[PDB]
Design a binder for this molecule. Structure first.
Ligand SMILES: [Zn+2]
Lengths: 11, 153, 49, 196, 50, 240, 148, 121, 76, 107
């Protein structure tokens, strides 16, 4: 499922 | 524990009467088990300390009932209106969760609905899944009377 | 010739382990489990017809 | 030529009467063996005539030692006396051959049989167990074996409570628990009375 | 889907992705070798059959 | 390897009543009938279930020959939940306790031992496990404990005696059911050290055939044991 | 469940390190008939061949085949029942002796196979570590036995 | 009936002490109750020799329990003074263990005594 | 009990799981059995090892005796 | 003589089912067992197509008191997930960092 999700607003 | 106090040794099971502790069918079952048991005999010195332990069980159970009644008296004097609606046990749990009666008073009714289901609530919120709808109030008497989807309502 | 046959025998001893399980002294130390894993659906028994 | 069967239970002695004698030459045939397994067929061969439960746990252990040594207990002598007719010679099927001589000495009029035909019948009785008693109170055979097994085993080993050290283990587990709870509850008494 | 992850969550997700790439490379390398031995094996059977 | 606080994944085995604990290493596991203690110092695994703390025990193949059989891939094990098992040669609770785990509360295990010193610890274990019935008696004379045993679904014989075949047959005739299971642990050295193990194993299979036991499969227990095998057979009372 | 039978621990690659004197020999039906034709004694012919004590074995299937041969082969049945010849019980339905012998050697790698059947010999040769005995010429001959 | 049982006779004791001495020279002997206990746990013991005159006898009675669980033969000899002398050490020995080795030079001697101990048991 | 004490001895028995278990262990295993609560506690370590060996023998006399006495524990 | 006889005339072996929408920690643990072959260069396993079982449990090992030194983990080293312990191992991370790099240049 990690491939399904995408990370945004990173610091 | 009471069975230990009434009869200390399996030998006594023949004459000792367990009527006040157990129903008829159960009390005869222990009598049959006593003679055909696989256990070993114990000394009076061993018996005395096991009796002492058993006496602590009944005393603690007795006081536990006292504390339950004491809390009921407290709940009917500190939050009488709440107890009439939800009850003493669930009402007391609600106050303890917030930490104070005022802290619970300043909470919206929505939070009081799901007060005891934070783990499911925040898991559901972060994973785009349906949220809980009873929380700690599920154990209120009125919610029990409801059935099906009416429990949520 | 003696050195050649020595290397040949020890080479064959390595290959025998691949062909079949060989006793190697048993357990040494705490039992750490099956290092290569356990296969649930495979049987190695010789079945009588 | 078998007419009565002796089966020993943990609960007591059971005596049966063989209504139909299964074929002896054809004993090894598959169909007759299948009859032993099938409950419905088995009832046609034998029928329970008497059952004498042991008075208590002590009697069961005493007869277990006697049955182990191939001896006739006073309870076994009584049950056979009431069942076996005086009578040429009544035939009794017994599982153990060593028991035959002892029965013969007490009862000269009974000749004991322990051949494979008898063993098949004894085997069938063990298979159906309480189902063959027609509801007569035999307790439960599984629980009776459990208590008797410990009694029989410990008697030979001569186990004594003096060796027991489980009391020490329980006492230590209770002592430190008491110390924790004595400390725990005592702090609450300070808290409760701390307000006042 | 767009999501927002903390530092610890990001480390766990990065660690998994590293492992799968290593596993994928190792699995393929074993496949290619055994595939080659099949090719070498076949070229020898053609001599046996012929 | 499987250190103290490590976390593992417990999944069911092909055989009922047996589990596999996955991880960096795989462990054969059986559910603990008496949680909170180990009988011979084995490692235990705790799982939280809705929450009750269920416990598991590790089955060491180098200590239990039946466990060495499961490692080697035995096709059929008649020991299963809710079955009566007659265990011959039950020195102590090292392997019987695990058999008691598999059969479960509904099952019962008849443990037969001859020597008194191993017998005493068998009695002490049997109390913790209500489904174990200890019988301190010589298995060469099944008539002595006939009252204490009913019919059994399977017979497991670990007696390391030259005349073990006779002991197996006598107990199977008295107590084993028709079409019942027979599982024998054979040590070549105990029976005949003069000949090779293979000759011994073939000889034992012949004696089982003579005693109306049909062998189903055979397996050697390497690398856990040397010159050992497990023979699994079915008892055909009528004939072979 | 998949089954892959384990390779016997009695085999060091193609060498059977279990078969050692005294030997155990499985007798085929034709072996006795050919032995009578060549005037070769079963026990002594084997001892001369291997220079060791040999323990001949006859299974139920082979005994069944000998009885079915008929009165012509009365001598073979009498020799087969010599007390020195031990008997092996069978727990399988078919009486076909060729499959019975092949299955026994697959199960245990401790037997020599004594036969002259071309079909049976070919099958045994594919099984590793199985010495094969036959009667040829004037006496017996053993093929796959390193100790000779 | 006595706790130390079986006790080897005069003829059997000398053969046991003979094998013990040869094993000592070949580094196939484990001396002392503690070292004997470890061999039983590792399953590397042919058989265990114990001294029946140990004072008290109870400090070596765990070994028969371990032996009978593991099916390892064991036997008692009358004297620990004699056992220690045969072991090759300068002090009395109450227990000793012959280590398993199928490639030893004294294999036949060990199995000979091992058989008689099994007959004794 | 005489060698180390009633409470300390009782804790050691519980750690082994039983008195029979304690007697079966080797002296090295007994020492690490009470090495998490410091039951027996460079020269300090030698006394701990020495006391562990004697504790192992004391357990054997108690377990394998029908009516154990304190005579040997005293001299030990 | 008085007789009333005349007067008498007139399941234990079931594992928990994993919950749907299972935690990410469990999925990351299940992946590690599936791909355990790649974790250590020196460890190799029998070829197995391991599928996620229908029912399973996550358990914590308990060592015997005698295994305090041999087979025990320190409390600080223990982690709730198999993955978190693996990250702690310094040798493992060094191998992964090196091995992860080489695949990248080749790609
Ligand atoms: Zn056949």
């Amino acid at each position: 499922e990690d491939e399904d999700e995408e990370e945004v607003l990173a610091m | 524990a009471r069975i230990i106090l009434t009869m200390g040794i399996r030998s006594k099971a023949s004459e000792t009467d367990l009527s006040e502790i157990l129903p008829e069918e159960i009390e005869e079952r222990v009598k049959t088990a006593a003679e055909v048991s696989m256990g070993t005999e114990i000394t009076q010195t061993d018996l005395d300390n096991i009796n002492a332990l058993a006496e602590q069980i009944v005393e603690f159970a007795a006081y536990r009932e006292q504390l339950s009644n004491y809390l009921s008296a407290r709940m009917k004097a500190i939050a009488p209106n709440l107890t009439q609606l939800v009850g003493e046990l669930v009402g007391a749990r609600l106050i303890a969760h917030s930490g104070s009666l005022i802290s619970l008073a300043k909470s919206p009714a929505s939070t009081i609905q799901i007060l005891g289901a934070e783990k499911a609530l925040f898991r559901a919120l972060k994973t785009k899944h349906d949220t809980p709808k009873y929380g700690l109030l599920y154990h209120a008497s009125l919610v029990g009377q409801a059935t099906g989807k009416n429990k949520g309502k | 010739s003696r050195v050649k046959k020595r290397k040949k025998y020890q080479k064959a001893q390595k290959k025998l382990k691949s062909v079949r399980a060989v006793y190697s002294g048993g357990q040494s130390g705490v039992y750490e489990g099956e290092k290569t894993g356990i296969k649930k659906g495979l049987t190695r028994s010789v079945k009588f017809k | 030529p078998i007419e009565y069967l002796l089966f020993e239970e943990p609960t007591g002695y059971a005596v049966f009467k063989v209504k139909l004698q299964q074929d002896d030459i054809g004993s090894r045939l598959k169909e007759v063996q299948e009859q032993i397994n099938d409950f419905g067929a088995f009832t046609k061969l034998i029928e329970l005539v008497s059952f004498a439960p042991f008075k208590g746990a002590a009697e069961a252990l005493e007869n277990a030692n006697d049955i182990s040594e191939g001896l006739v207990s006073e309870s076994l002598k009584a049950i056979l006396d009431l069942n076996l007719p005086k009578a040429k010679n009544i035939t009794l099927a017994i599982s153990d051959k060593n028991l035959g001589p002892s029965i013969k000495e007490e009862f000269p009029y009974v000749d004991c049989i322990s051949n494979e035909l008898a063993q098949d019948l004894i085997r069938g009785v063990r298979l159906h167990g309480e189902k063959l008693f027609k509801g007569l109170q035999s307790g439960d055979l599984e629980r009776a074996q459990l208590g008797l097994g410990h009694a029989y085993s410990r008697a030979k080993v001569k186990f004594s409570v003096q060796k027991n050290d489980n009391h020490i283990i329980q006492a230590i587990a209770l002592l430190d628990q008491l110390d924790k709870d004595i400390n725990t509850f005592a702090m609450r008494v300070k808290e409760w009375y701390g307000w006042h | 889907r767009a999501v927002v992850l903390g530092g610890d969550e990001k480390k766990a997700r990065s660690f998994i992705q590293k492992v799968l790439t290593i596993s994928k490379a190792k699995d393929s390398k074993r496949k290619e070798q055994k595939a080659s031995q099949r090719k070498e094996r076949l070229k020898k059977l053609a001599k046996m059959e012929e | 390897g499987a250190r103290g606080g490590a976390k593992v994944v417990i999944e069911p085995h092909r055989h009922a009543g047996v589990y596999i604990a996955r991880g960096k290493e795989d462990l054969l596991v059986t559910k603990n009938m008496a949680p909170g203690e180990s009988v011979y110092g084995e490692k235990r695994i705790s799982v939280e279930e809705p929450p009750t703390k269920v416990e598991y025990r590790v089955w060491n193949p180098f200590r239990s020959k039946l466990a060495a059989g499961i490692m080697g891939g035995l096709d059929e094990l008649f020991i299963a939940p809710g079955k009566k098992v007659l265990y011959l040669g039950a020195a102590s609770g090292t392997s019987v306790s695990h058999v008691s785990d598999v059969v479960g509360p509904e099952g019962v295990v008849y443990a037969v031992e001859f020597s008194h010193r191993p017998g005493r610890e068998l009695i002490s274990m049997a109390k913790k496990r209500p489904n174990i019935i200890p019988i301190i008696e010589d298995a060469r004379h099944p008539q002595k404990y006939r009252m204490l045993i009913g019919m059994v679904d399977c017979v497991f014989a670990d007696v390391a005696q030259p005349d073990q075949a006779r002991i197996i047959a006598l107990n199977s005739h008295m107590f084993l059911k028709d079409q019942g299971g027979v599982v024998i642990s054979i040590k070549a050295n105990c029976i005949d050290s003069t000949v090779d193990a293979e000759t011994v194993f073939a000889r034992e299979v012949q004696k089982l055939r003579e005693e109306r036991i049909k062998p189903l499969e055979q397996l050697t227990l390497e690398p856990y044991e040397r010159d050992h095998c497990i023979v699994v057979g079915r008892y055909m009372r009528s004939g072979l | 469940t998949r089954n892959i039978p384990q390779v016997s621990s009695a085999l060091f690659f193609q060498y059977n390190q279990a078969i050692k004197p005294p030997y155990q020999v499985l007798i085929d039906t034709n072996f006795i008939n050919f032995s009578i034709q060549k005037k070769v004694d079963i026990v002594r012919g084997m001892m001369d061949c291997l220079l060791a004590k040999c323990n001949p074995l006859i299974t139920d299937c082979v005994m069944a085949e000998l009885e079915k041969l008929g009165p012509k082969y009365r001598i073979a049945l009498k020799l087969a029942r010599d007390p020195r010849i031990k008997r092996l019980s069978c727990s399988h339905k078919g009486t076909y002796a060729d499959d019975c012998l092949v299955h026994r050697v697959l199960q245990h790698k401790c037997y020599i196979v004594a036969t002259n059947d071309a079909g049976l010999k070919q099958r045994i040769r594919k099984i590793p570590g199985i010495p094969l005995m036959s009667v040829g010429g004037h006496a017996y001959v053993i093929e796959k036995l390193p100790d000779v | 009936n006595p706790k130390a049982f079986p006790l080897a006779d005069a003829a059997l004791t000398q053969q046991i002490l003979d094998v013990v001495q040869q094993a000592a020279n070949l580094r196939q002997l484990k001396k002392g109750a503690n070292e004997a206990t470890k061999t039983l746990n590792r399953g590397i013991s042919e058989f265990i020799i114990m001294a029946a005159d140990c004072e008290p006898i109870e400090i070596l009675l765990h070994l028969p329990l371990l032996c009978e669980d593991k099916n390892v033969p064991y036997v008692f000899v009358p004297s620990r003074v004699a056992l220690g002398r045969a072991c090759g050490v300068s002090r009395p020995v109450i227990a000793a263990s012959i280590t398993t080795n199928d490639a030893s030079a004294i294999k036949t001697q060990i199995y000979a005594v091992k058989d008689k101990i099994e007959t004794l048991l | 009990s005489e060698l180390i004490g009633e409470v300390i001895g009782a804790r050691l028995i519980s750690h082994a799981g039983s008195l029979t278990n304690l007697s079966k262990q080797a002296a090295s295993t007994v020492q690490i059995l009470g090495a998490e609560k410091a039951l027996f506690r460079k020269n300090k370590g030698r006394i701990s090892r020495y006391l562990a060996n004697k504790c192992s023998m004391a357990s054997r006399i108690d377990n394998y005796s029908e009516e154990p006495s304190n005579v040997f524990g005293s001299v030990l | 003589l008085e007789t009333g006889f005349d007067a008498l005339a007139n399941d234990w072996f079931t594992l928990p089912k994993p919950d749907d929408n299972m935690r990410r920690e469990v999925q990351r643990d299940l992946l590690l067992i599936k791909h355990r072959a790649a974790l250590d260069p020196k460890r190799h396993y029998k070829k197995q197509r391991w599928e996620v079982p229908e029912r399973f449990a996550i358990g914590t090992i308990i060592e015997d008191k005698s295994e305090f030194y041999s087979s025990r983990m320190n409390r600080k080293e223990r982690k709730s997930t198999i993955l978190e312990t693996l990250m702690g191992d310094e040798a493992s991370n060094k191998y992964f960092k090196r091995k992860y790099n080489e695949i990248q240049e080749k790609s």
